[PDB]
Amino acid sequence: NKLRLCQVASVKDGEPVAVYQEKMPALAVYNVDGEVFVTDNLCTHGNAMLTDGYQDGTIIECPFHGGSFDIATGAAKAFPCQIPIKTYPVTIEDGWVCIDQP
Ligand code: FES
Numbered sequence: 102n103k104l105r106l107c108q109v110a111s112v113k114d115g116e117p118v119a120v121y122q123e124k125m126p127a128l129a130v131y132n133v134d135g136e137v138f139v140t141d142n143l144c145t146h147g148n149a150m151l152t153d154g155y156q157d158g159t160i161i162e163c164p165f166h167g168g169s170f171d172i173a174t175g176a177a178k179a180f181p182c183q184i185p186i187k188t189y190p191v192t193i194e195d196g197w198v199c200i201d202q203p
Contacts, residue, residue, distance in 0.1 A: 105197040106130055112137060112198065117161065119152040120198075128189075130198055131172050133159050138172045139191050139200050145177065145184035 106120040107130055118130040119142055127142035129152045142150045144163045151170070155162040160178065162169040169179035175188040189200040 102202060103192060103194060103199040104202050105194070105199050106139065107198050109137060109193055109196055109198055115156050117152045117156055119150060124202060126187075128200075129161070131156060131161065133172055137191050137193070137198055139189040139198065140170070140172060140175065141187040144168060144182070145186055146181050151186070 104122055107118055112118050112130050112132040114132045120128045120130055129140045129142040131138045142152055144151055146168050147165055149163050149165045151161045154164045159171055159173050160169050161172050166181050167179055168182035170182055170186045171178055175185040177183050177185050192199045
């Protein structure tokens with residue numbers, strides 16, 4: 102069923118949270134205008150973590166190359182990002198950010 106990632110309270114808009122859950126690839130947790138989204142953290146273009154880049158609303162920019170993704174959709178937006186980031190459907194369970202065990 103569900104995997105707890107981090108407390109909802111820990112995720113501020115503009116400051117994504119790296120979560121390393123033992124079943125999963127590195128994960129990134131975001132708050133966009135008060136709502137939570139979860140993506141893979143490893144950039145699809147290289148060896149950088151998206152939680153070390155720059156959130157601008159629904160856009161997360163990679164710390165390298167100027168690449169970017171849409172947090173909410175997974176879309177690769179700014180070049181050189183081309184392969185969409187994996188996203189996960191999010192549930193809040195008792196104050197925790199959760200995703201399904203996949
Ligand atoms: S490693 Fe993220 S855009 Fe190149």
